[PDB]
Curated annotation (Swiss-Prot):
Similarity annotation: Belongs to the beta/gamma-crystallin family.
Keyword RNA-binding annotated: no
Residue ranges of every copy of the Beta/gamma crystallin 'Greek key' domain listed in the record: 2-40, 41-83, 90-130, 131-173
Entry remark concerning the domains of this protein: Has a two-domain beta-structure, folded into four very similar Greek key motifs.
Subunit structure: Monomer.
GO molecular function term, any single one: structural constituent of eye lens
Keyword rRNA-binding: no
PROSITE patterns named among the record's database cross-references: CRYSTALLIN_BETA_GAMMA
Keywords of the record: Acetylation, Cataract, Disease variant, Eye lens protein, Repeat
Domain of life of the organism encoding this protein: Eukaryota
Gene3D superfamilies per record: Crystallins (2.60.20.10)
Pfam families: Crystall (PF00030)
Name assigned to this protein: Gamma-crystallin S
């Protein structure tokens, strides 16, 4: 199936820990993480146990330093595999105001700049009609990441955000 390997040092050195299912805490086994190998699927990794703190999405690949997953540092301690619905597609509605109000935009495409495409820098509510998406605080898929996995989000706290700042978003594809 899918599998992720965490290493305490850069370049896949040092003690390691392997997962193939969700893990709410691996701090018992690894006190830091400086490189990751992801196989067979896409994973969400979290700064703190029980899927809290900053989140980073990692598709299949080798990550020999934390910068390669846009990490802030080497502090990671939980992870969840991102399950994509079989043969599914992607559609999202974004709203200018809370509770699905104000100006709406509906799209099936990745958006590297919400300002250039939709002339907004904030999203106050959202419906994911199909698929799984990532919201980013900054343009070009940078900053805080938030995982939006298919259905309704009345307020930014519902996707884990303390503010409505979103400036790019994209689909998690196979």
């Amino acid at each position: 199936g899918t599998k992720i390997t965490f290493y305490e040092d850069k370049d896949f050195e040092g003690r390691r820990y392997d997962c193939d299912c969700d893990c709410a805490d691996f701090h018992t086994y690894l006190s830091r993480c400086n490189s990751i190998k992801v196989e067979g699927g896409t994973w969400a990794v979290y700064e703190r146990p029980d899927f809290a703190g900053y989140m980073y999405i990692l598709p299949e690949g080798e990550y020999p330093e934390y910068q390669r997953w846009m990490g802030l540092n080497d502090r990671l301690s939980s992870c969840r595999a991102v399950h994509l619905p079989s043969g599914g597609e992607y559609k999202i509605q974004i709203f200018e105001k809370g509770d699905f109000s104000g100006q709406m935009y509906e799209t099936t495409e990745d958006c590297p700049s919400i300002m250039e495409e939709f002339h907004m820098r904030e999203i106050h509510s959202c419906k994911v009609l199909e698929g799984v998406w990532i919201f980013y605080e900054l343009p070009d898929y940078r900053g805080r990441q938030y995982l939006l996995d298919k259905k309704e989000y009345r307020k930014p706290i519902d996707w884990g955000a303390a503010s409505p700042a979103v400036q790019s978003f994209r689909r998690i594809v196979e």
